[PDB]
Symmetry: C2
Subunit: 301 residues, 2 copies
Amino acid sequence: RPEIKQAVTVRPGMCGPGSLFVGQLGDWTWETVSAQCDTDVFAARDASGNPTYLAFYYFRVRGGRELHPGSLTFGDRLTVTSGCYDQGTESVLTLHRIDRAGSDDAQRPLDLHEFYERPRDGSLYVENFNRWVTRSAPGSNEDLVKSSPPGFRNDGLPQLPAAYSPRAVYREARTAHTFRALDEPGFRLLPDTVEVEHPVDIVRDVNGVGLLYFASYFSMVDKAALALWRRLGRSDRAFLRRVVVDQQMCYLGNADLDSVLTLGARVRVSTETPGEELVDVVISDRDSGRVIAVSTLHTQH
Amino acid sequence: RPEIKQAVTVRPGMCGPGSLFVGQLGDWTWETVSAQCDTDVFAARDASGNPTYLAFYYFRVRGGRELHPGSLTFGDRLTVTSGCYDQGTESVLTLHRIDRAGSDDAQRPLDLHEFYERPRDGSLYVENFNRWVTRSAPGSNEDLVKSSPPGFRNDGLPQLPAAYSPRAVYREARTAHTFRALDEPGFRLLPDTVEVEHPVDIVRDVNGVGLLYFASYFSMVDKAALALWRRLGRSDRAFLRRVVVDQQMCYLGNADLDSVLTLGARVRVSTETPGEELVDVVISDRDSGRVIAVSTLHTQH
Ligand SMILES: [Cl-]
Ligand SMILES: [Cl-]
């Protein structure tokens, strides 16, 4: 299996202009997969005894003006509905819908059509596509290898039709370096861009197993975004006021803890709605020749 | 009421060399006080309708070689025991003991004597002393004012004897700028110190209500500590390996989101045990003339 409903009171540890909300989202994904695929995701190991991690690969957060991540304050009552979909033995799709606890029809079950074609204002839709991986060498964060812990059961799971394919979505972003095609009408590109050098921050960016922490990617993207916001003369206070109505992240790789990353950012402004923009950020590990992440944010000023 | 026992599987969102574990600790304090003092801490308001926050004031984490925060990895099974103690109507003390789920006598209730005079190796002891506050002016983070939400019930709570007084502990650290008196025998002070300028990081340091986030203070301290670790030639890899067996933080103030903070750090090395040190960090808001935090860490290299 059944979907997992929970009543959630918003805590300081899962809101604010940082990456704490996304961190909460991923911990619910690992809990939801554990419950539905008969596997202790937290302590997962492959037959050798190697630890295997249910790594974040594609991550979407979509809301809108009436509920977005920046709308959440301490003490807000929410309803969270969660469940997995079959993507075979090495990968799994986890969905989360978040509603205000009061709201009309908050009890409704997950609905792929709603998530993928008819998103409602006032609901927050989370898509986490995750893939089992292991280190290819102790202490290396490069060249992660595909895994599946023994006993991972995808068989119970509901099916996704071919139209809703996280795989397609991420393949196109890896190629284009945005999740919103550069020729969408109704946008024009500004000439101002930034390229920020970011040494891995070993106090804030690293997780419990010595990999870069998946929520830190959101922090790196917001750092590149802030830099651009600043390069084009806007205020720190207005930055804290931006409304992020949609954001997608593809995790192409991890990195070693001494790497120097590069954070590239660009923005397109709406020619219809004032103050609506698309910001694209690419995170590179120049030294290994890899793009390790791509993110697009859809914002209202 | 009764103490709150929970079985906890360690998640990526509450471990690692960052401040995520301390963030988890504070969310359990707010849940524990909510349960024992009949108050929704998350959504607390005073009679006017002003939001009132159960602010972190004094924070201790004490473990040891057999269990410290850096010992926790994904999937670890823990037992957590929590409860509040009466400190009147404007403040409350919350204790948490954390044991490995397997261990001898993990079911035992909280014991003030154990916490304050006989801490056991293999247990982690958390002390959170918190005070209700409100903003004195919309959008200001300075000059917070004492509060108590209506209906806060400290009456149920067990009593603390005069010997165990968080108040005394913090008063001495505010004066001395360490929690370990400068004349403790068995330590000598190194001449190397650092002073790091730290503009408030609006993507990573700010909480859901626009105040500096209490766990960010731990990140700022670790930044000042890393700087010192580096100034005296040690490796990033060895920094990730430090064992923090005790840490205390006093939160003297908050700061506005455009402040530039100063992070001061010093270290004393053991003359008995090799590789045991005390690192003291002071966080200043030069421009308002305030010390906003003091922290001492007891480490094994
Ligand atoms: Cl992670
Ligand atoms: Cl906080």
